[PDB]
Design a binder for this molecule. Structure first.
Ligand SMILES: Nc1ncnc2c1ncn2[C@@H]1O[C@H](COP(=O)(O)O)[C@@H](O)[C@H]1O
Length: 487
């Protein structure tokens, strides 16, 4: 009842909520160095639109550099910046750093609570069980200001928003918090699988942020099940896991020897065909929760094979600048997913990317059906009218809330995992066509046109690629097709 009214109000009063949010954001910031220079003396929406420039990351980086280096955040935000977000996008090989504060986590947990209600409205049999969720923490980078830079979900996991989260099915995992918080993701993924297998009847959902990570978890399971079952049989975690938090918390989950359970799992895994394996090991699973839009659509056939066509539920579209919104038709096919922007997240504007809309920039409530746009974001952490670099397509409207298909990220040419290699990067590499191969796991780049040539191309790519390729092992060695490989 409360949720039904909440969602009706959010998607019906879009214009009013957006206009009030802009006033809410701008009013305490009119005296910042940044907004004072565009002479926004008081809050006035037409003055904001006329005087405040639409900017790229590059335009405002001088201001962000000052905050990163320790200058008072009030140069851009009266809401103190207490950390930064590392974006998967880069500017000159360097990851972009976005300003961040707890309003990011206020919005994120608002969206978690909303999509939880959307899921349970449409999917039965989930509220009495737990999620086997392959969630990972990545260690933070220090900035000269002394504030940490983290990836979006790590900024949540390492906060009390996560530690002191609510107590219901949607925030209940088969993995202890220590496993989720473990910065060694090889150890934590193994422990995720171990705890999920031990509590296999309680699993009602499984997944990860992106479909690539869900696929990797299944491949690790395929390559680790004999060892996992030996830990279940003995009641002892393998010695190689060094994280103390994992050792202590997983030992409690194991409890003692489980040779009968081990036998049961070994009998399932021992089939030559891995088709439907997820459903056979976790028979109470109701759905797979993972993003399957954008470059992640390449993994849908693999996921359907392993999960025996359990629904793939792609819930959220977000970025280091802001969370955008959620999928209000969770049980649709992957190719049909659209995201309804939520008007309380940030003030959204849109630049037309085709001839169907001839305006220079338009408000959320004015976007035209069937037209493409680049989103523009004004947020609660010092970003004013910043271009996001994504292209979206207006597919419809839920009440008065536009729904958007994610089309692509501008200039990105190659993407396997979190990496987003764009045309400039592939250019430097070749000067020092392409295809993203996923038919084998791990996926890898393919540069059509020598062992050394493969290496120097990889060495010129960005840090996200190199962390995925050499550390997580989510990308294989780059291949120049005679066929040659990096190493
Ligand atoms: N649900 C989604 N579907 C497709 N692409 C997405 C989705 N969520 C995020 N992305 C992409 O990932 C970007 C976020 O990058 P980051 O700044 O590293 O958080 C977005 O701007 C999109 O390009």
């Amino acid at each position: 009842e409360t949720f039904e009214k909440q969602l009706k109000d959010l998607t019906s009063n879009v214009k009013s909520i957006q206009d009030n949010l802009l006033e809410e954001i701008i009013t305490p910031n009119t005296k910042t160095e940044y907004l004072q220079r565009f002479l926004i003396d008081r809050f006035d929406k037409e003055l904001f639109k006329k005087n405040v420039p639409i900017v790229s990351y590059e335009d405002i980086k001088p201001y962000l550099d000052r905050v990163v280096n320790g200058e008072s955040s009030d140069v851009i935000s009266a809401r103190t910046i207490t950390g930064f977000l590392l974006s998967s996008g880069t500017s000159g090989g360097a990851q972009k750093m976005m300003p961040w504060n707890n309003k990011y986590l206020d919005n994120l947990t608002f969206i978690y609570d909303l999509r939880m209600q959307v899921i349970t409205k449409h999917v039965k049999g989930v509220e009495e069980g737990k999620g086997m969720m392959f969630l990972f923490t990545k260690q933070e980078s220090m900035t000269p200001s002394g504030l940490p830079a983290r990836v979006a979900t790590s900024s949540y996991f390492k906060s009390d928003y996560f530690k002191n989260r609510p107590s219901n099915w949607y925030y209940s995992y088969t993995s202890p918090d220590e496993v989720i918080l473990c910065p060694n993701n090889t150890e934590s993924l193994y422990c995720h699988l171990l705890c999920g297998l031990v509590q296999r009847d309680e699993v009602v959902r499984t997944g990860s942020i992106f479909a690539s990570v869900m696929v990797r978890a299944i491949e690790v399971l395929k390559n680790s099940w004999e060892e996992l079952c030996s830990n279940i049989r003995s009641g002892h975690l393998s010695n190689w896991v060094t994280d103390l938090g994992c050792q202590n918390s997983v030992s409690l989950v194991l409890g003692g020897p489980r040779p009968e359970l081990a036998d049961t799992i070994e009998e399932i895994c021992n089939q030559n065909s891995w088709k439907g394996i997820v459903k056979r090991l976790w028979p109470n699973t109701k759905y797979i929760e993972t993003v399957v839009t954008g470059s992640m659509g390449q993994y849908v056939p693999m996921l359907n094979y392993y999960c025996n066509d359990l629904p793939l539920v792609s819930t959220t579209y977000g970025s280091s600048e802001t969370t955008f919104g959620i999928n209000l038709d969770p049980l649709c096919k992957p190719e049909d997913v659209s995201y309804t922007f939520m008007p309380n997240m940030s003030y959204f504007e849109f630049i037309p990317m085709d001839g169907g809309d001839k305006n220079d920039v338009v408000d959320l409530e004015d976007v035209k059906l069937g037209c493409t746009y680049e989103p523009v974001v004004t947020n609660f952490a010092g970003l004013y009218r910043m271009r996001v670099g994504d292209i979206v397509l207006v597919t419809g409207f839920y009440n008065n809330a536009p729904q958007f298909k994610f089309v692509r990220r501008e200039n990105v040419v190659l993407s396997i995992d979190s990496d987003k290699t764009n045309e400039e990067d592939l250019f430097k590499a070749v000067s020092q066509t392409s295809y993203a191969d996923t038919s084998t796991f791990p996926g890898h780049y393919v540069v059509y046109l020598l062992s050394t040539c493969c290496l120097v191309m990889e060495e010129s790519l960005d840090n996200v690629y190199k962390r995925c390729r050499f550390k997580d092992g989510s990308i294989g060695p780059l291949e120049i097709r005679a066929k040659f490989f990096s190493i």
